[PDB]
Each structure stands twice: as C-alpha cells, then as structure tokens.
Design an enzyme around this catalytic site. Structure first.
Site, PDB file in Angstrom:
ATOM      1  N   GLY A  12       0.820  -1.197   0.000  1.00 30.52           N
ATOM      2  CA  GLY A  12       0.000   0.000   0.000  1.00 30.52           C
ATOM      3  C   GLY A  12       0.856   1.250   0.000  1.00 30.52           C
ATOM      4  O   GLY A  12       1.999   1.228  -0.454  1.00 30.52           O
ATOM      5  N   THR A  15       1.923   7.093   5.116  1.00 30.26           N
ATOM      6  CA  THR A  15       1.700   8.530   5.240  1.00 30.26           C
ATOM      7  C   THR A  15       2.526   9.277   4.195  1.00 30.26           C
ATOM      8  O   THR A  15       2.139  10.345   3.719  1.00 30.26           O
ATOM      9  CB  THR A  15       2.045   9.034   6.657  1.00 30.26           C
ATOM     10  OG1 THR A  15       1.050   8.576   7.582  1.00 30.26           O
ATOM     11  CG2 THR A  15       2.092  10.553   6.690  1.00 30.26           C
ATOM     12  N   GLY A  17       5.442   7.986   0.851  1.00 34.95           N
ATOM     13  CA  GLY A  17       6.160   6.906   0.200  1.00 34.95           C
ATOM     14  C   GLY A  17       5.315   5.666  -0.034  1.00 34.95           C
ATOM     15  O   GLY A  17       4.144   5.614   0.347  1.00 34.95           O
ATOM     16  N   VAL A  19       4.965   1.279   0.079  1.00 39.48           N
ATOM     17  CA  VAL A  19       5.404   0.125   0.857  1.00 39.48           C
ATOM     18  C   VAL A  19       5.323  -1.183   0.076  1.00 39.48           C
ATOM     19  O   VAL A  19       4.319  -1.470  -0.574  1.00 39.48           O
ATOM     20  CB  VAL A  19       4.584  -0.018   2.154  1.00 39.48           C
ATOM     21  CG1 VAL A  19       5.177  -1.106   3.043  1.00 39.48           C
ATOM     22  CG2 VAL A  19       4.538   1.307   2.893  1.00 39.48           C
ATOM     23  N   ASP A 128      -1.023  10.115  15.138  1.00 44.43           N
ATOM     24  CA  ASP A 128      -1.809   9.523  14.056  1.00 44.43           C
ATOM     25  C   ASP A 128      -2.190   8.080  14.364  1.00 44.43           C
ATOM     26  O   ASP A 128      -2.111   7.207  13.501  1.00 44.43           O
ATOM     27  CB  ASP A 128      -1.063   9.607  12.718  1.00 44.43           C
ATOM     28  CG  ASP A 128      -1.997   9.486  11.514  1.00 44.43           C
ATOM     29  OD1 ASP A 128      -3.224   9.676  11.677  1.00 44.43           O
ATOM     30  OD2 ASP A 128      -1.501   9.213  10.401  1.00 44.43           O
TER      31      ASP A 128
HETATM   32  C1  LIG Z   1       0.271   2.862   7.045  1.00 48.02           C
HETATM   33  N1  LIG Z   1       1.661   3.024   6.728  1.00 48.02           N
HETATM   34  C2  LIG Z   1       2.534   1.888   6.811  1.00 48.02           C
HETATM   35  N2  LIG Z   1       3.849   1.855   6.539  1.00 48.02           N
HETATM   36  C3  LIG Z   1       4.460   0.660   6.692  1.00 48.02           C
HETATM   37  C4  LIG Z   1       5.967   0.504   6.404  1.00 48.02           C
HETATM   38  C5  LIG Z   1       3.641  -0.409   7.120  1.00 48.02           C
HETATM   39  C6  LIG Z   1       3.947  -1.747   7.375  1.00 48.02           C
HETATM   40  N3  LIG Z   1       3.172  -2.709   6.795  1.00 48.02           N
HETATM   41  C7  LIG Z   1       3.397  -4.009   7.016  1.00 48.02           C
HETATM   42  N4  LIG Z   1       2.550  -5.026   6.362  1.00 48.02           N
HETATM   43  C8  LIG Z   1       1.194  -4.805   6.030  1.00 48.02           C
HETATM   44  C9  LIG Z   1       0.320  -5.936   5.907  1.00 48.02           C
HETATM   45  C10 LIG Z   1      -1.027  -5.752   5.576  1.00 48.02           C
HETATM   46  C11 LIG Z   1      -1.527  -4.452   5.359  1.00 48.02           C
HETATM   47  C12 LIG Z   1      -0.672  -3.331   5.476  1.00 48.02           C
HETATM   48  N5  LIG Z   1      -1.205  -1.970   5.241  1.00 48.02           N
HETATM   49  C13 LIG Z   1      -0.959  -1.103   4.115  1.00 48.02           C
HETATM   50  C14 LIG Z   1      -2.213  -0.763   3.380  1.00 48.02           C
HETATM   51  C15 LIG Z   1      -3.196  -0.077   4.282  1.00 48.02           C
HETATM   52  N6  LIG Z   1      -2.542   0.563   5.389  1.00 48.02           N
HETATM   53  C16 LIG Z   1      -2.435  -0.267   6.551  1.00 48.02           C
HETATM   54  C17 LIG Z   1      -1.334  -1.293   6.501  1.00 48.02           C
HETATM   55  C18 LIG Z   1       0.701  -3.524   5.815  1.00 48.02           C
HETATM   56  N7  LIG Z   1       4.421  -4.410   7.827  1.00 48.02           N
HETATM   57  C19 LIG Z   1       5.229  -3.489   8.442  1.00 48.02           C
HETATM   58  C20 LIG Z   1       5.005  -2.139   8.230  1.00 48.02           C
HETATM   59  C21 LIG Z   1       5.875  -1.133   8.897  1.00 48.02           C
HETATM   60  N8  LIG Z   1       6.541  -0.367   9.403  1.00 48.02           N
HETATM   61  S1  LIG Z   1       2.077   0.283   7.288  1.00 48.02           S
END
Ligand SMILES: CNc1nc(C)c(-c2nc(Nc3cccc(N4CCCNCC4)c3)ncc2C#N)s1
Lengths: 299, 257
Positions: A12, A15, A17, A19, A128
């Site tokens: 996804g 906030t 960048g 991921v 947040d």
């Molecule tokens: C919300 N911002 C984020 N940044 C990081 C780096 C995140 C993060 N995410 C995961 N894995 C993961 C698994 C399932 C869903 C998600 N989402 C992204 C889409 C919607 N937003 C909620 C989370 C993420 N593992 C470690 C990190 C870290 N740090 S979440």
C-alpha cells in the site's frame, strides 16, 4: 544494499512513500520496504522522513514496529521495517460476523498502552493513531506503526502543528484549537480505537471538524467549565454550541463490562489533565486477567 | 507531568551519547574556535531573521559540532556545513521550516541549491540520522518549572546565558547541556532575584552548587565580558521586548560561591 532484497508485492502507501513486502535473500527475513523518492523532491529529504527515521531508531520496544535499516541508493531512500501480516482495520472487517474475542481486545489494548507509554516516556508523540497504523502478526502481537506524523516534544510542551491526527480519532482539545496539546491526544485516539474493537465501527465518524465535535458532544455531553475548566475560553469554543446531556457509558459501548467502561471513560476524559496516561492505564483492573492469545483468524 | 521524570532521565542518558568530541577543534587543521564563533553568531541572526525557535538554533549547533567531530572541513566550506545543519534542524523542529531556496539565499549566493542539498544528505549520513539530541534549551524549560513563582526575566535571562555558551567552543564543549543549563538557570535566578539553585533541582538533577561551580565560574565571566565579545548577535537579539530586554541587565559583580 537493495541487491539482497527480492520484492514480493506492493502492500500500500504510507503517510508518505510506497510500501512493499520483500524478502532478504541471504537471511530469509521478510521485511516491509518504504520507498521515498528524493528525485521529484526539490526540497531535499522530507521532514516526515527525517522525523520518522530519527525517532524510530530510538524506540526499541516489542510493541513498536522495528526499523531495521535505512538504505540510500541512487536518488532513493529505502526504510527497511520488520514485516507484520496485517493492520487492525482489516482484521476488524474480517471479524464482522464473529466479533473479536474479549481476551484479544484486552490483549491488544494492553499492548498498545505499553507501546504508547514507551513513546511518551521517550518524549515522542505519535499523533496519528488509528486502526490502519496498528499492525498485528500471527503470534498475537500488535504494534504502533507509521511515525510519519510523530514529533519529539518538550517539557513543558510548545505549540506544535495544528493539523494532526486523522479526524475520527482527533482529540477535543485539538478540535477546539488549544495552543498546547500533549500526550493526552494519543490516549484519546486509543480510547476511540478501544471502543471500535468492541463494536467494529468507529466511535466518532465525523465528516468535518464541527460534525466531529458535535458527535463527541452528543455522546459524552457538551463540556462546561466544571468538567473542563478553561473550555469556554478556548479559541474555537462557541457559546452557541448545543448543550447535550452526557449519556450513561453503558450505552456508548453496551457489550463492555464495568471495568472496561471505567477504563474507556478515563481515556475519553474531556480535560487532558484528567485523561488517564498510558502508564497509569497499564494497572487498570480491566487488565487483571490479560493474556496474549493468537488472533482467532488466519491472517 | 506523568512523564516529566522519565523524560529528564532519558535526556540525561542521551546527552552523553550525543556529546561532540571536546577536543575536535585542535584536530581541525584549517578551522578555529573563532571561525566557529562567527558561524554560530550568524546562525543566531538567521534564526531571528526567520523567527525560528531557539531549540532549532541549539539543535543546529549540536549537529555542527558532531559533524566537525568526525569530518575535516576547509574554512571555505564551514558555512555550507552550518547552512545544511540549520535546514535539518528547521525540518526536524519547526512547524513551518523555511524553504531550501531561502537557505540558499542567506548564504549570499556563496553556494548553490545543489550544494546545500548534497551537504544535507552528507550531514544525515555522518550523524547517522540521529537528530533528536538533548539541548541546553530542553533542560532549561524543565528547570523553569521549579521557580516559585515563575519569573519571565529569570527565564529569558537563562535562555540568553545558555545561548551565549553556544558561541565559544572553548570552554563550553567540555560541559554537558544539562550542566550548562544548571549554571544558566542559577546565574539568571541570582541576577534577577538573588535566589539560588533550588533544593528541588538538587533532588531532580543530583547537581549541587559545588557540582555546577566550574561551569558557573566560566559562564559568569562570559556574562561579564559579553559587551566586549567580538560576536554580538545574541545581545542584540535579547535586547528585544520579546525576551524582556534581559541583555540590558547588569551581571552581578560576584557570585559568593
Ligand atoms: C500505514 N503506513 C505503513 N507503513 C508501513 C511501512 C507499514 C507496514 N506494513 C506491514 N505489512 C502490512 C500488511 C497488511 C496491510 C498493510 N497496510 C498497508 C495498506 C493499508 N494501510 C495499513 C497497513 C501492511 N508491515 C510493516 C510495516 C511497517 N513499518 S504500514
């Protein structure tokens, strides 16, 4: 080096960048990569990135997502985090039918409070907290993530950025334009999240700032000088505010028992000075029989 | 209130991990204490010009000294280091940091935007992104809570004195921020009210007047000589009604220590 990471899939957007889920090819470790593009940045390294990195390097706690590494490649900044399987929001949606077992809610709240207490003890405000920024794994852990809005605070606090916290979880003192806010704002957010784990719907889903306030007023009652001294002098207070009666907490979150309602009400105190701290909350009777069970659902 | 003790303890720990090397200037072949004093004085001016927080100034100076503790710099590049440090400090600490173009502008076109941004990245690499350093300012604001009652002139004068210490690496590189803040707070308290380092801060910090004496002796001299110091931006700054014109107060002739 990025060479040792094999990408798996886009997860996804944070906030700031983008991921990705990736795999360390040598150690086998599964990580989350946050890519920040420095080209397209005529302003150098973003302040959000500078804060997230510096603050997160100091915060080593089992309930705070671990920053593993920071990699500067050609025109790119990669943040390497430990990988967690899911966020709280999607887990609550998946539990639409069965609901979330009380032991898990209890365990999650207890862990979030530990993590938050550590932040505040190290002069960091998160600013947040919302289900989307709370990450869970398959072993029963939950951790604070996304420190893009955080900042290091002073004692006593100074005026900081006003536009903070996602609306639904924003504290009344921010909504009312107080010159100073502090650790209490993060506690307010956790209280909203506590209520949401029980009902699986947001406590105060406002569409605007005034709608948000009125939703809060209609549930907790309109604050006066007795419950919150100084409230009528706050920059955005208006005498025209409708004056709603405070309703029994047994009606705000009906499934909650005596202990839970007690804790919730202290987390949602209008007066930031009276609102319970994460540290003090750890010892609330609500947690007397707390354990750390795995999620009841396959992630 | 609930974390004030936890936080003080944490800052006491961090300030040690973030201390620059006390003897770095000797090992810098092409720069001197004087050149550094000119740089910091100029940053004070930049701070005033853009209405930046004092915390931001204190942070920038910490970044500079840490940078110079491990990197050799020619005199012609000193200001570039200082400019990037102030930009980083602003980004970290300010609600509305000035834009890069403005930092390029204040160097009177000595450096390009490209140079300023490349240096920012180098500073980040050298400091390994560890920007949340304790400052004299952070300790001062904590100490201020121990006044009975609170006095603006005391507070402003303490900040004035703490800021003076930023200018002179010799001797102030040898004292921790919490210790300089101690001396500053006592000296301001004594100057304005005749009071001294309160017993409640002895309990909080572990410092006594004897413990603070060496730094106090130095600070007192700096205070007495401030009108004759080559750098004046701080005195000028603290002439302003914003800081209750505390730089116009007469330093005490003796401290009776
Ligand atoms: C919300 N911002 C984020 N940044 C990081 C780096 C995140 C993060 N995410 C995961 N894995 C993961 C698994 C399932 C869903 C998600 N989402 C992204 C889409 C919607 N937003 C909620 C989370 C993420 N593992 C470690 C990190 C870290 N740090 S979440």
């Amino acid at each position: 080096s990025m060479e040792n990471f094999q990408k798996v899939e886009k997860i996804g957007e944070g906030t700031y960048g983008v991921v990705y889920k990736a795999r360390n090819k040598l150690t086998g470790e599964v990580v989350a990569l946050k890519k920040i593009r420095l080209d397209t940045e005529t302003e150098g390294v973003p302040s959000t990135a500078i804060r997230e990195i510096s603050l997160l390097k100091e915060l080593n706690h089992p309930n705070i997502v671990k920053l593993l590494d920071v990699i500067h490649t050609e025109n790119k900044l990669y943040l390497v985090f430990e990988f967690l399987h899911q966020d709280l929001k999607k887990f609550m949606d998946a539990s639409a039918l069965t609901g979330i077992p009380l032991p898990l809610i209890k365990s999650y709240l207890f862990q979030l409070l530990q993590g938050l207490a550590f932040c505040h003890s190290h002069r960091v405000l998160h600013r947040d907290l919302k289900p989307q920024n709370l990450l869970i794994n398959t072993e029963g852990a939950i951790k604070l993530a996304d420190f893009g809005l955080a900042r290091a605070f002073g004692v006593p606090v100074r005026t900081y950025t006003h536009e903070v916290v996602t609306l639904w979880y924003r504290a009344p003192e921010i909504l009312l334009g107080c010159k100073y806010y502090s650790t209490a704002v993060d506690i307010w957010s956790l209280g909203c999240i506590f209520a949401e784990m029980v009902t699986r719907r947001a406590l105060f889903p406002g569409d605007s700032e005034i709608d948000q306030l009125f939703r809060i007023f209609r549930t907790l009652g309109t604050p006066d000088e007795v419950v919150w001294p100084g409230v009528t002098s706050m920059p955005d207070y208006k005498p025209s505010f409708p004056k709603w009666a405070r309703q029994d907490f047994s009606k705000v979150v009906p499934p909650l028992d005596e202990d839970g309602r007690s804790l919730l009400s202290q987390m949602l105190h209008y007066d930031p000075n009276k609102r319970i701290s994460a540290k003090a909350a750890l010892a609330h009777p609500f947690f007397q029989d707390v354990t750390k069970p795995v999620p009841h659902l396959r992630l | 209130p609930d974390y004030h003790e936890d936080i003080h303890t944490y800052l006491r720990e961090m300030e040690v991990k973030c201390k620059p090397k006390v003897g770095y200037m000797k090992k810098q072949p092409d720069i001197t204490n004087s050149m550094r004093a000119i740089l910091v004085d100029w940053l004070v001016e930049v701070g005033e010009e853009y209405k930046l927080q004092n915390e931001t100034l204190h942070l920038a100076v910490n970044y500079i000294d840490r940078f110079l503790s491990s990197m050799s710099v020619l005199r012609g590049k000193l200001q570039l280091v200082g400019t990037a440090a102030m930009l980083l400090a602003s980004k970290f600490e300010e609600i509305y940091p000035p834009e890069v173009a403005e930092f390029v502008y204040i160097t009177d076109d000595t450096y390009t935007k490209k140079q300023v941004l490349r240096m920012e990245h180098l500073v980040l690499k050298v400091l390994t992104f560890d920007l949340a350093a304790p400052t004299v300012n952070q300790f001062l604001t904590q100490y201020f809570l121990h006044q009975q009652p609170a006095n603006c002139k005391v507070e402003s004068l303490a900040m004035f004195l703490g800021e003076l210490s930023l200018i002179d690496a010799d001797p102030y590189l040898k004292y921790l921020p919490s210790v300089i803040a101690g001396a500053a707070f006592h000296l301001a308290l004594y100057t304005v009210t005749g009071q001294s380092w309160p017993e409640s801060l002895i309990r909080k910090t572990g410092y006594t007047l004897e413990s603070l004496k060496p730094c106090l002796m130095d600070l007192h001299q700096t205070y007495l000589k401030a009108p004759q110091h080559a750098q004046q931006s701080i005195r000028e700054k603290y002439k302003n009604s914003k800081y209750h014109g505390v730089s116009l107060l007469n330093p005490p002739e003796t401290l009776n220590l």
